Design a binder for this molecule. Structure first.
Ligand SMILES: [Zn+2]
Lengths: 171, 88, 252
DNA sequence: GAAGGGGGGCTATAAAAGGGGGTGGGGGCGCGTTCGTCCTCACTCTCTTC
DNA sequence: GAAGAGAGTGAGGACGAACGCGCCCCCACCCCCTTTTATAGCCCCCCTTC
């Protein structure tokens, strides 16, 4: 690919390199060597340097060179708990379980270790959304209580009748 | 002379002969497939999965896995959701 | 239920439609019998798939002009096979073609696998594969075909006289009885017998002509004809009028 | 050029492997009609006006 | 004492959202591919004789 195919292989090669465990940054020219992109266009060399390698959220500019961003990705149980806490504190929202799994290898160990601290919501497509378990105010009760509560239909009542009950019972 | 008994229809055997001669598509190495996918990206911005299979000439399951590794699919309200070769 | 006659077989009556105590006369039930009718005097995928196969079965039948009763029998086989679901992988057209073949065999009018193939997009090999599977699934069996099960269709399709058809049937039956063609397919024996009978009458059909209707390559007819040719006088019926003498029958 | 013969192939029969290809059943998904929603207009009373 | 715009009401016409009606697609599920073997018949293609 011209102006589009080369960058894809750079990202793929960089991702694979990190999986090996090489946190050391790599130069633009060095990465091009192992990606068989030595003949890349000059205008793409500056374009990747100025735009592709900085705008992407997985590229870290260290001492001029570029390195992966495992810090942003969750790679520890503590980071997993912290990320959810910030989401609840700032009200950012939940995160799909698949997103955590790819970012966190063996995410099952972290998820099970935290246990109830993570709230799981099952989407129609089996996707699980993780939410922080705010343990400030908790209230869990027996199942039949909700069943009786559900038995008390309220959507099929008017405001006048609902408010009339208050004076009917004397409260 | 109509519907004369025949072991197999002439069209059916000819089609089978063509398929047998052509053979099933093989699983090319990821590097070669990736290079072909990237090279074809220049011609047009977006490709259809069925059409892309013909261009790459690879098994659908293998191609989808390779495409999923980098490529993504964008929902379009005009015809349907189609695969986009751009990873980003 | 005569109050006087506990457990009495009440007799039905068509005069007013009531049941009467057989030995009391009492009418139990005023006019309850309903004499007139009593006596003669958004589609599910499974159903849609069945409906298409039913349409395919009829389409196949008309091509070879099969009676509706065989088509009705074929539909029952398809429902049994479709319900049992041992052929879920196999295409419905292939199942229907095998069901049509089985229905013909069950009714005593077999059609050769080639004949069913000619009216179906499914090849003979696939029909045979489905044919065996259906028998296992239905736990049923089909009587072994005989050379005479195809003489009427083959001879009539060849426009051969009735005497020739009887002579061919006698030749084919006798040849199998004499074991002159051990292991040969009944169709091949019938085709050879038709050729032997045809050449002995005014109406003479070439080997290619007999092969086309019977679906048997002339080489196979030639092989079978060579096996029965030596015993030609014995196979022919005694009261057969030879337009061409048996001694002068074609040799090949 | 017609016909016979030789050589070759097709089919079933088990079993196993791994993977491509064909197919039925859903599932989101755009396009040709249909009814409700929105808009338009004739015929008079009304407060106001003269 | 004698009369204009405007609006309620009656009443007619055009366009959008929803309901289908399927076109297309994606996803399980199965069968096919291959090789080995002996067997027998049937069938097709090529060579040979006349
Ligand atoms: Zn009685």
């Amino acid at each position: 690919g011209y102006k589009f195919g080369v960058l894809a292989k750079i990202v793929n090669y960089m991702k694979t390199r990190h999986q090996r465990g090489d946190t050391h940054p790599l130069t633009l020219d060095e990465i091009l060597d192992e990606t068989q992109h030595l003949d890349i266009g000059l205008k793409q060399k500056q374009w990747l340097m100025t735009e592709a390698l900085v705008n992407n959220p997985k590229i870290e500019v260290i001492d001029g060179k570029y390195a992966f961003k495992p810090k942003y990705n969750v790679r520890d149980k503590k980071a997993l708990l912290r990320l959810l806490d910030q989401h609840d504190q700032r009200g950012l929202g939940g995160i799909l379980l698949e997103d955590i799994e790819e970012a966190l290898p063996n995410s099952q160990k972290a998820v099970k270790a935290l246990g109830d601290q993570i709230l799981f919501v099952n989407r129609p497509d089996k996707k699980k959304i993780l939410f922080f378990n705010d343990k400030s105010c908790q209230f869990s009760v027996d199942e039949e209580f909700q069943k009786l509560w559900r038995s008390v239909t309220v959507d099929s009542m008017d405001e006048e009748k609902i408010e009339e009950y208050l004076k009917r019972q004397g409260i | 002379t109509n519907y004369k008994p025949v072991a197999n229809h002439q069209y059916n055997i000819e089609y089978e002969r063509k398929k047998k001669e052509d053979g099933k598509r093989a699983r090319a190495d990821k590097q070669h497939v990736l290079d072909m996918l990237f090279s074809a990206f220049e011609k047009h911005q977006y490709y259809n999965l069925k059409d892309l299979v013909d261009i790459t000439k690879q098994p659908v399951v293998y191609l989808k896995e390779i495409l999923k590794e980098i490529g993504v699919q964008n929902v379009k309200g005009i015809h349907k959701n189609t695969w986009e070769l751009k990873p980003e | 239920t005569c109050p006087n006659h506990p457990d009495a077989i009440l007799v039905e009556d068509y005069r007013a439609g009531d049941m009467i105590c057989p030995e009391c006369g009492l009418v139990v039930g005023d006019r309850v019998i309903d004499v007139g009718s009593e006596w003669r005097t958004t589609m599910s995928s499974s159903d849609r798939a069945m409906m298409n196969a039913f349409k395919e079965i009829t389409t196949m039948a008309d091509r070879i002009n099969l009676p509706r009763n065989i088509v009705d029998r074929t539909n029952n086989l398809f429902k049994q096979v479709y319900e049992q679901k041992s052929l879920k992988g196999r295409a419905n057209d292939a199942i229907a073609s095998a069901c049509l073949y089985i229905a013909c065999r069950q009714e005593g009018v077999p059609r050769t696998f080639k004949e069913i193939c000619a009216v179906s997009r499914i090849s003979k090999k696939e029909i045979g594969r489905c044919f065996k599977l259906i028998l296992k699934a239905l736990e049923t069996s089909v009587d072994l075909i005989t050379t005479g099960d195809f003489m009427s269709r083959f001879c009539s399709n060849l426009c051969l006289p009735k005497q020739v058809q009887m002579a061919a049937t006698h030749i084919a039956r006798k040849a199998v009885e004499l074991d002159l063609v051990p292991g040969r397919s009944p169709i091949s024996v019938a085709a050879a017998a038709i050729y032997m009978a045809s050449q002995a009458s005014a109406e003479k059909r070439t080997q290619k002509e007999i092969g086309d209707i019977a679906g048997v390559a002339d080489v196979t007819i030639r092989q079978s004809y060579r096996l029965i040719y030596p015993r030609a006088p014995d196979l022919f019926p005694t009261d057969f009028k030879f337009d061409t003498p048996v001694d002068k029958l074609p040799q090949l």
